[PDB]
Amino acid sequence: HMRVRLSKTLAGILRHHPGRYGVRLTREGWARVSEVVEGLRKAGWSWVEEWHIVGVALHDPKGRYELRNGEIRARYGHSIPVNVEPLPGEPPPILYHGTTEEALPLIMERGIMRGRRLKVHLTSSLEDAVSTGRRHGNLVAVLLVDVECLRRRGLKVERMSKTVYTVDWVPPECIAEVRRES
Ligand SMILES: Nc1ncnc2c1ncn2[C@@H]1O[C@H](COP(=O)(O)OP(=O)(O)OC[C@H]2O[C@@H](O)[C@H](OP(=O)(O)O)[C@@H]2O)[C@@H](O)[C@H]1O
Ligand SMILES: [Cl-]
Ligand SMILES: [Cl-]
Ligand SMILES: [K+]
Ligand SMILES: [K+]
Ligand SMILES: [K+]
Ligand SMILES: [K+]
Incomplete structure (x- = not known):
C-alpha cells in the first residue's frame, strides 16, 4: 500500500481535524491509536489496523510522529491547540x-x-x-x-x-x- 498517502491523512488527523475521523486528542496532542484506526476504516481505509498506523510512525523519515503504548501524536505542525514538550538538544546557530x-x-x-x-x-x-x-x-x-x-x-x-x-x-x-x- 502507499505509506505516504496514509501518512498524509494521518498528519491531517493529528494536526488539524481529529474530530472528522472520530478522534479526541489530549492537550498534549495524543490520540488513541484504536480511535485513529476506526476513523480511517470508516473513511474507506478498509485494511488499516494498529500495526499499519504504528508502522507509519516508525517508518516516517522525518520523525513527524511519536508513539507510546496505545497512543500516537504529531510532534509539530498543529493548527489545533496542543502543548508538546521539546526534545533534548540545542538549536544550531x-x-x-x-x-x-x-x-x-x-x-x-x-x-x-x-x-x-x-x-x-x-x-x-x-x-x-x-x-x-x-x-x-x-x-x-x-x-x-x-x-x-x-x-x-x-x-x-x-x-x-x-x-x-x-x-x-x-x-x-x-x-x-x-x-x-x-
Ligand atoms: N508574513 C508572511 N506573509 C506571507 N506569507 C508568510 C508570512 N509568514 C510566513 N508566510 C508563509 O505562509 C505559509 C504558511 O503555510 P504553512 O502553515 O503550511 O507553513 P509551512 O512552514 O509551509 O508548513 C509547516 C510544515 O512544513 C514543514 O516545516 C513541516 O512539515 P513536515 O512534517 O513535512 O516536515 C511543517 O509541518 C508559508 O509558505 C510561509 O512561508
Ligand atoms: Cl510506552
Ligand atoms: Cl504548529
Ligand atoms: K484519542
Ligand atoms: K509532526
Ligand atoms: K511554519
Ligand atoms: K517553540
Whole structure:
C-alpha cells in the first residue's frame, strides 16, 4: 500500500481535524491509536489496523510522529491547540524556512508568521526547506534565520524532531539571508 498517502491523512488527523475521523486528542496532542484506526476504516481505509498506523510512525523519515503504548501524536505542525514538550538538544546557530518568492515582501514587513498553525516551523535541513517551499509554489526562496537573534529577544526555539524546530514568530531582522531556488 502507499505509506505516504496514509501518512498524509494521518498528519491531517493529528494536526488539524481529529474530530472528522472520530478522534479526541489530549492537550498534549495524543490520540488513541484504536480511535485513529476506526476513523480511517470508516473513511474507506478498509485494511488499516494498529500495526499499519504504528508502522507509519516508525517508518516516517522525518520523525513527524511519536508513539507510546496505545497512543500516537504529531510532534509539530498543529493548527489545533496542543502543548508538546521539546526534545533534548540545542538549536544550531542558523535554521532554514522554505517559502515562495511571492511571500518575501510581506515576510520582510511582518516577519515569518505562524499563519493557521500554532508555530512557525524551521528546519536544520536546507533540502527539507526547499521541499516545504515547493508545496506552495514553483519559485522557492529559503530564508536563513539567525537563531541567536530570536533567542536573545526572548523567543524560544524549541526542538520538535531531529531537524524541526518551532518558534512563535521570526522578526524580519533575524532573517540573515535569502537563497533562491527556481
Ligand atoms: N508574513 C508572511 N506573509 C506571507 N506569507 C508568510 C508570512 N509568514 C510566513 N508566510 C508563509 O505562509 C505559509 C504558511 O503555510 P504553512 O502553515 O503550511 O507553513 P509551512 O512552514 O509551509 O508548513 C509547516 C510544515 O512544513 C514543514 O516545516 C513541516 O512539515 P513536515 O512534517 O513535512 O516536515 C511543517 O509541518 C508559508 O509558505 C510561509 O512561508
Ligand atoms: Cl510506552
Ligand atoms: Cl504548529
Ligand atoms: K484519542
Ligand atoms: K509532526
Ligand atoms: K511554519
Ligand atoms: K517553540
